[PDB]
Structure formats: C-alpha cells, structure tokens
Amino acid sequence: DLRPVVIDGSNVAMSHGNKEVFSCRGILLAVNWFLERGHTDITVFVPSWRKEQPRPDVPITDQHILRELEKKKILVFTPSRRVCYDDRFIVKLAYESDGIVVSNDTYRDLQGERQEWKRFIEERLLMYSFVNDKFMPPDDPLGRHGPSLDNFLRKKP
Ligand SMILES: [Mg+2]
C-alpha cells in the first residue's frame, strides 16, 4: 500500500530539540504524523545507549517515550555497548524494504560507500522542518520533477 517508513530517530529528536537536546517528543510527533495518515509500517531506529542515564553532555527530554514506542513495535533499538551502527541500520533497512527514510542527514559517508545507497538516498530521503511541535515534510519532496508527497509515500500513484 504505502512504502515502509524508516525514521532516523536521533536526527528527528535532535531537530525537535533545536540541536541542543535529544527531544523524544520530536520522535513521537513524527511518528504520529505518519500514523494519522494511516501508515502501519513505521520503524524508528535509536541507539540503545539512549536508554541509559543522561550524561550532562547528552541531555534528553521525555525519555520515557522510547520504551513506550518500543512496546508498540514502532521503535527498535540499534545495538551499542562500552560503538554504534545507527545510520547503516537505517539505510540498509529502508533500502532492502524498498521504503523511505525520514531524516535531514544525507549520510554522505554511506553514499560514498555503496553506489546503490547513494542513488537510494537521492530518491527516498524525506527531509523536514520542525516549527515548535509542527512536523513539516515537503509537499513535493523531489520538486516539480517529482510526485506529490501523497504519491511519494505510496508504492504506486
Ligand atoms: Mg545518525
């Protein structure tokens, strides 16, 4: 029906947090935007270490939301222990499920690594802005030479 959606959880939370705080409400707001439109295939990746106690250099708000979304099978923790794999999981999953990635990160390093991921990101990256709690994706994500947001999120127009 609709393409699978993969949300770069950290990119969205930091964005909603004005790039100063990991804002978990940002993730929930992005998730709800897709849910409201009837999406059922939504995966949000976040590194497992975001479950730990906040260091003072890694502030986080509304942390309780992460386990709530995990319990709803929407959020999936990416592994980490005392290194991470976050961006690669995001891109690999979206690519292999022929879905879309929600992030403002363009993953330049991954683009240079595999050409198929370079082209995938060029065609499937959905960028956005937050205005306070308003999640705003572009109406024409690929421009005049592209589909409507509506069709961009669908397997077929
Ligand atoms: Mg990242």
Swiss-Prot record:
Protein name per its UniProtKB record: Endoribonuclease ZC3H12A
Its taxonomic path starts at: Eukaryota, Metazoa, Chordata, Craniata, Vertebrata
Region RNase, residue ranges: 1-157
- The RNase NYN domain sits at 2-151
Full-sequence portion shown in this chain? 134 to 296 of 599
Which keywords does UniProt give here?
Answer: Angiogenesis, Antiviral defense, Apoptosis, Cytoplasm, Developmental protein, Differentiation, DNA damage, DNA-binding, Endonuclease, Endoplasmic reticulum, Host-virus interaction, Hydrolase, Immunity, Inflammatory response, Magnesium, Membrane, Metal-binding, Neurogenesis, Nuclease, Nucleus, Phosphoprotein, Repressor, RNA-binding, Stress response, Transcription, Transcription regulation, Ubl conjugation, Zinc, Zinc-finger
Q: Which example biological process does GO assign this protein?
A: protein complex oligomerization
The residues listed in the UniProt record as binding Mg(2+), with positions renumbered to this chain, are D87
Has UniProt tagged this entry with the keyword Cell membrane? no
Q: Does the keyword Ion transport apply?
A: no
Question: Which organism was this protein described from?
Answer: Homo sapiens (Human)
Domain comment in the entry:
The C3H1-type zinc finger domain and C-terminal region are necessary for pre-miRNA binding. The C-terminal region and proline-rich domain are necessary for oligomerization.
